[PDB]
Design an enzyme around this catalytic site. Structure first.
Site: not given
Ligand code: J55
Length: 228
Positions: A41, A89, A183-184
């Site tokens: 995602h 994922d 993530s990733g």
């Molecule tokens: N694995 C995690 O702790 C985690 N992953 N995600 C999803 C995630 O990070 N993503 C999925 C869509 S693209 C990416 C994302 O949101 N990236 C992002 C956003 C703002 C700042 C920065 Br640096 N990076 C979370 N969203 C909110 C809180 C925690 C997480």
């Protein structure tokens, strides 16, 4: 990375920054000369925008000789991945051309034997994800050493209430944890890729909500299938 340290520049040559419109979205890991493994995602809401994979980086903004940008020729998500689940994922990104290998760009050997990482093992997670709850985006690569958590503890109702399958793994999240943007990214144990930071929204830095990572060994056959 919450509660981490700035990583030693180019000490993790496998580290990749999955970017959209020259803005970091997710981490990634070079698994082959022309393949970067990431979370499913990450490319969500990307649509109209330039997706590129940044290799050989430490600072996201500053010029570096090792820094190189690649177009994504092919984006292979896991067939069973859905935004509602944290399951399967994984995403396999084929670069436009093979990566120029060097001291700062080198693929990481990933776990090809499906056996759980023993709880209490210290694993290294790196990335350009948020460094504090306010949401500070770091310019340079961060990293943290976290011990692998027992799945049984992780699946407690107070914790992830059964959500952690045999294909997923946990690590401790007491202040020091992985977060938004990590993530990733890779979870490395004994210089081998073991997990891939999930792309599912979650609460960071709370010890009762451990960090969730996709076990690469659990998807070894699929990865091999795609790469071949
Ligand atoms: N694995 C995690 O702790 C985690 N992953 N995600 C999803 C995630 O990070 N993503 C999925 C869509 S693209 C990416 C994302 O949101 N990236 C992002 C956003 C703002 C700042 C920065 Br640096 N990076 C979370 N969203 C909110 C809180 C925690 C997480």
């Amino acid at each position: 990375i919450l509660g981490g340290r700035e990583a030693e520049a180019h000490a993790r040559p496998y580290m990749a920054s999955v970017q959209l419109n020259g803005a970091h979205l997710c981490g990634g890991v070079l698994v082959a000369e022309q393949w970067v493994l990431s979370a499913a995602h990450c490319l969500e809401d990307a649509a109209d925008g330039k997706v590129q994979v940044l290799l050989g980086a430490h600072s996201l903004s500053q010029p570096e000789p090792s820094k190189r940008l690649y177009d994504v020729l092919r984006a292979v998500p896991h067939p069973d991945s859905q935004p509602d689940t944290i399951d399967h994922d994984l995403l396999l990104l084929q670069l436009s051309e093979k990566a120029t290998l060097g001291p700062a760009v080198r693929p990481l050997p990933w776990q090809r034997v499906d056996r759980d990482v023993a709880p209490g093992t210290l694993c290294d997670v790196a990335g350009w994800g948020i460094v504090n709850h306010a949401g500070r985006r770091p310019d340079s690569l961060q990293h943290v050493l976290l011990p692998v958590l027992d799945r049984a503890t992780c699946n407690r109702r107070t914790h992830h209430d059964g959500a952690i399958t045999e294909r997923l793994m946990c690590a401790e999240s007491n202040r020091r944890d992985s977060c938004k943007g990590d993530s990733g990214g890779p979870l490395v144990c004994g210089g081998v890729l073991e997990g891939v930071v999930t792309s599912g929204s979650r609460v960071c830095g709370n010890r009762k909500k451990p960090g969730i990572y996709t076990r690469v060994a659990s998807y070894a056959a699929w990865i091999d299938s795609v790469l071949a």
